[PDB]
Design a protein around this ligand. Structure first.
Ligand SMILES: COc1cc2cc(c1Cl)NC(=O)C[C@H](O)/C(C)=C/[C@H](C)[C@@H](O[C@](N)(O)OP(=O)(O)OC[C@H]1O[C@@H](n3cnc4c(N)ncnc43)[C@H](O)[C@@H]1O)CC(=O)[C@H](OC)/C=C/C=C(\C)C2
Ligand SMILES: COc1cc2cc(c1Cl)NC(=O)C[C@H](O)/C(C)=C/[C@H](C)[C@@H](OC(N)=O)CC(=O)[C@H](OC)/C=C/C=C(\C)C2
Ligand SMILES: Nc1ncnc2c1ncn2[C@@H]1O[C@H](COP(=O)(O)O)[C@@H](O)[C@H]1O
Ligand SMILES: [Fe+3]
Ligand SMILES: [Fe+3]
Lengths: 674, 674
């Protein structure tokens, strides 16, 4: 029994179903493969097309999933989609009324077109199953819990009719208990408030991280105007008819001005975040307290995008409402896609289920075999120096104790937003200066941002306060207090309020990552490491070996440990041996506006990526003429000939374009099949 | 007292407040001037910046209005803006939260800045008066009716808080009787339905045009699901949580699918438009039946953009609910901008009321003086031939009876959407072929819509059924039955139901134009002409002299009468003397897209207009090189020399671009200070 789990929109690699399709119209595209109830493969399309939280159809991810499972498309019994058919089709239909050129292709046609043109797979109509959205979330969250009965809570932006559903799960049966309509959405509330801090969709956990720096008292009475707790677990949010945003009109009237990009985070900003955080905590806990005592369950599964609010999860844990809590590593809409497969397998036959609580998120493609990895690292030889230690884990521990910041890339990539020892960046967790530098030099982001620790399972309760319910900590789902006599020891990973979004790694969770953390602690006294996602500010988590090295070279990381190979930057790297390649979304433009006295303006030259919210950059005329000659095979050095050779001026410009990922730079060839 | 009335957004000429600012965000920019209670001058900014229904700050409109009154900016006693401050500032705030790079400038600052920069006008805060939107509409509609008391009804898409408001008006006193909340919007219902017909904002008149071709019984039980008539002149529209459109989800669920660009109108589309129109007729007559009885009033003013529904107005006339009915020539938001002037004067000093009933929309800038116009037509010599008849109206009547189709440009331009004898295209109205001949050829549009008759006040009732109430017909506000006997006589101007959007011209509403239609009737026994707006498919009604000549040369009209001059296109006109200039929104682009095997793809060259819904055209490499060298002074022929001279190929390419108004082409210099 082999079932595919789908979610996302239906856009091709180089265009969107409608021009400039908005970034929130079916986001976080992914594919999941379940076999005999076990999740054997899952990857988000963002990892393969390098567009954070992409809406494009997860074609690549279906191809990679089938590969990991050793299956051909003809082997797939059923395909599940994470939304009912009428609903996605009504929203497609709306987009078409706004774009009269766009042909009327609805989701069934478009799914079948993409699979057949992209994989040579005529999918039979009888094998395509559409699924209620919060039902898909529920299966995902609950089946992987290792629990045979639980209260299941789903909160996200919105399914087809509800912003929240409450379920009773017993064995493999889900039974709806309650639902909350769309205009009461808490993910809608959080995203609306996020826009006031100069952020956008995808940034909600940055706002979460800012919250502890603020005082929730300043704006408590203001947020109080926007919601009302009612009897028997109910609540309302209070809308307006001015703008499609629940928060900004009231705050404007009270003198709050939205932050601008580039501007610092004032104390009123920090307090806004703090009150918003408190608001959602008050509502969800109000919900949960009710349905805890009403349904009689002592175990909770929390899912939906809101369950990535690890601060909220830490409060649920410490509330005494439950004895166990479980959160899926992908509780946002990629997880809903996985659950759509369970639900599809349920409607065509009986539901085979996992036999154990999900402990590892390490479910995407791998980096490659030993010999193809050595072969590809030889292709980067003009740019990198490679050592091959006897015991790479032992070496890396030593380098981490010496204050090196390491890139760490092993095995299959993590499903979901957190990195957990397979696409990580790690450093000594003890020096407070490691927070300030890794924020400013490495990940190149805001100074208030916290960093998450990983601790061995054996030493966890030596450092953190895991008391209360038993939560799963293999995926940094819970914010947890650092024990007060440890907060100075752990300067980098102890947040401003003495909490940390902790990861407890074990031999069973991640044998190798646990070996590294164990040895570091043998060497230093402190079995705890800083562990942040391996990606710069312009890309999702690195996936392939070429992704890893590109990110290593364009980030200020000291050394890279990839599959037992020690990689370091060469002194004088040779950029010219790299082969430029346009992304399907790369565009080159020469533009002239109007000028003085109705003249033509002076030429300018930009490179930009053709999706909603994609970056832009001015380029020099020499670089513009170079990039126009890109054939995907000529190296950068021979391309530069046509503009008088790769000057140092040109290399630096290319390099900065490379950092922002406007086009692929990587040696000739590729690593090959895996 | 001198009061300026403003409406529209705050964008400058070349950019918008936020990038690609939606075309519905405070549209139909305009400026009006009142002095001692009289409307001295009013021009929509669309005529001056040449963008249909523009949202941009009406700076040119204000320069034109001040000069028309012989006034410095400093002379003005108050400025009135057609929306409350906190509402426009809350919408601006919402735009700013979605574009975190936009500086936080709200309306009071933006208004002062556009005036300080654009007119050197240091506007003191004391003088800026924001106005309730539906109050603005009502003042405009009622003070020009020449009525001394009336029931005032405003229906539009929405103001700050309502979509419909009912007023009692006595002299200068406005008293509010009733409101209808935003989600009951009939403008909204209408505009929603228009998107299902392949059309968009500003195409509502076309949907009205199509509805008689259709049978409302088909989709009548369907629309009945979307609304309910309730007691006491109340109605409910029934929404949905699927999409921001009232109509599309339910119609998708029954198999109605929207038409696409360039698709012919099917019988389903025809019937849809018929049921839509019947519905808003039902609801609006249900509102009016109640408020006519409850207020007891015999007179009705009607305003807000829904009042530009000529067919609905005709049902109000033919209902026996009122004696008089009045509709202002600019009942859409440009009229709310004038009414904002009046309300500012009332809030400050006292409100001086306009003398009599408005009879003439001729309120814009004029073409120029006889010496100026003659001189500028001399600059146009390489392209036209000019006769100076002794009696132009006399000659023009002859050609009309001979069968020529005439451009007719006199005096000041009409305020509001209808051309009424000052920027018109006139023709014999008797031959049915004249429909397709003028629509589907010279103006290059669509021919399902009949044309509009202008009849003399004297013969008016010998041709049309003006019975029922006493409506004002000086602005084509009412659709009325064509008398059955004259139906065959008037083939060009009579619909499938026998009705006609009637202009009734009198010696007092417009002298020159009355003489013209009388004389034509003495020469033919039919004192009815066809009257359409002087504009092709890519422009609003022409304004300037150069506007009028440009439009004549890029359409297939036979003759042009402009201020007693008879203008025809030369045998071989010399394009090369024209000086091309960029419009502030013109962009010239060389694009390269992604290509096969990750290469740099296709080098296309494009000209486009940078605004929401602006046209785009591909250009040849030679045009690209030519256009990029436009400097605002050098002629087209001299510019063409840098690419081998103005071939017939290039001149056709350039001409086709001129038809679509990507550029200004006109002789060197201007007409001068008008
Ligand atoms: C993302 O962010 C937001 C999004 C939205 C709202 C908001 C935000 Cl923040 N929030 C806000 O607050 C908006 C603010 O308020 C505003 C822009 C107000 C503008 C000034 C106002 O336009 C007015 N005042 O209605 O203009 P008017 O000329 O008098 O009439 C025009 C009407 O008349 C009908 N109509 C004409 N001709 C005929 C005929 N021949 N037959 C039958 N119907 C006809 C037309 O069909 C049309 O509906 C509102 C309006 O309608 C817009 O649609 C044009 C609404 C569009 C809906 C939205 C933008 C969703
Ligand atoms: C202009 O057209 C619109 C606009 C809007 C709504 C709709 C339509 Cl048509 N109507 C819909 O039905 C949208 C549909 O359901 C979608 C896209 C569901 C996705 C999978 C949601 O993803 C989840 N599961 O959270 C996305 C969100 O909620 C998101 O916040 C991330 C908030 C979005 C608010 C929006 C997009 C306002
Ligand atoms: N850390 C967070 N806190 C609160 N809400 C969040 C958080 N992350 C995502 N969301 C909301 O979850 C919604 C998306 O959920 P989903 O459909 O599962 O992808 C959006 O409304 C997000 O704003
Ligand atoms: Fe969801
Ligand atoms: Fe209006």
């Amino acid at each position: 029994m082999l079932v595919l789990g789908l979610n996302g929109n239906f856009s091709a690699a180089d265009t969107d179903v409608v021009p400039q399709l908005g970034e929130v119209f079916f986001h976080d595209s992914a594919a999941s493969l379940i076999r005999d109830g076990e999740l054997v493969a899952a990857v988000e399309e963002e990892r393969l097309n390098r567009i954070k939280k992409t809406t494009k159809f997860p074609l690549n991810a279906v191809r990679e999933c089938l590969a990991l499972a050793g299956a051909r498309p003809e082997d797939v019994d059923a395909v599940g989609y994470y939304f009912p058919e009428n609903h996605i089709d009504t929203v497609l239909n709306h987009l078409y009324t706004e774009y009269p050129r766009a042909p009327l292709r609805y989701s069934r046609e478009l799914i079948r077109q993409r699979l057949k043109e992209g994989l040579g797979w005529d999918l039979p109509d009888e094998k395509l199953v559409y699924v209620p959205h919060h039902e898909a979330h529920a299966y995902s969250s609950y089946l992987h819990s290792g629990m045979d009965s639980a209260l299941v809570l789903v909160l996200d932006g919105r399914g087809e009719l509800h912003s929240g559903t409450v379920y009773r799960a017993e064995g493999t049966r889900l039974e709806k208990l309650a639902d909350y309509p769309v205009p009461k959405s808490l993910g809608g509330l959080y995203l609306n408030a996020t826009y006031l801090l100069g952020y956008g969709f995808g940034d909600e956990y940055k706002v979460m991280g800012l919250a502890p720096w603020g005082n929730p008292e300043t704006y408590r009475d203001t947020f109080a105007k926007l919601y009302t707790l009612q009897d028997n677990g109910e609540y309302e949010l209070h809308g307006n008819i001015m703008v499609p945003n629940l928060v900004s009109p009231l705050f404007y009237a009270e003198g709050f001005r939205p932050r601008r990009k580039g501007e610092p985070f004032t104390q009123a900003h920090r307090d806004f975040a703090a009150a918003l955080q408190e608001t959602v905590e008050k509502i969800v806990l109000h919900i949960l307290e009710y349905w805890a005592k009403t349904s009689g369950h002592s175990r909770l599964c929390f899912g939906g995008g809101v369950a990535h609010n690890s601060s909220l999860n830490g409060l649920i844990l410490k509330s005494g409402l439950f004895d166990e809590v479980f959160v899926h590593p992908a509780s946002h809409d990629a997880g809903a896609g996985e659950g759509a497969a369970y639900a599809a397998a349920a409607s065509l036959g009986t539901l085979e289920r996992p036999g154990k609580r999900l402990l590892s998120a390490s479910l995407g493609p791998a980096l490659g075999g030993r010999e193809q990895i050595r072969a590809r690292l030889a292709d980067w030889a003009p740019l990198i120096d490679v050592e091959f230690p006897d015991d790479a884990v032992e070496t890396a521990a030593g380098l981490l104790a010496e204050g090196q910041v390491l890139g760490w890339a092993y095995g299959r990539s993590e499903f979901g937003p957190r990195a957990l020892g397979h696409r990580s960046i790690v450093a000594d967790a003890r020096p407070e200066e490691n927070r300030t530098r890794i924020n400013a030099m490495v990940k190149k982001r805001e100074g208030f941002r916290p960093f998450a620790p990983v601790v061995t399972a054996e030493a966890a309760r030596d450092y953190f306060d895991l008391s209360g319910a038993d939560g799963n900590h293999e995926f940094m789902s819970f914010v947890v207090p650092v024990l007060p006599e440890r907060r100075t020891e752990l300067g980098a990973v102890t947040h401003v309020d003495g909490t940390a979004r902790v990861q407890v790694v074990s031999a069973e969770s991640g044998e190798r990552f646990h070996r590294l953390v164990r040895r570091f602690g043998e060497l230093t006294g402190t079995p705890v490491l800083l562990n942040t996602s391996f990606n710069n500010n312009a890309e999702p988590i690195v996936q392939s070996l070429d992704d890893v090295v590109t990110s290593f070279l364009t980030t200020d990381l000291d050394v890279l440990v990839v599959e037992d190979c020690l990689v370091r930057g060469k002194a004088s790297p040779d950029l010219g041996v790299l082969v430029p390649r346009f992304r399907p979304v790369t565009r080159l433009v020469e533009r002239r506006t109007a000028g003085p006295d109705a003249s033509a303006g002076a030429k300018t030259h930009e490179i930009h990526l053709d999706y909603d919210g994609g970056p832009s950059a001015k380029v020099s005329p020499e670089l513009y003429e170079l990039l126009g000659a890109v054939d995907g095979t000529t190296t950068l050095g021979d391309l530069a000939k046509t503009v008088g050779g790769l000057s140092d001026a040109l290399a630096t410009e290319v390099f900065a374009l490379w950092e922002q990922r406007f086009l692929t730079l990587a040696p000739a060839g590729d690593i090959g099949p895996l």
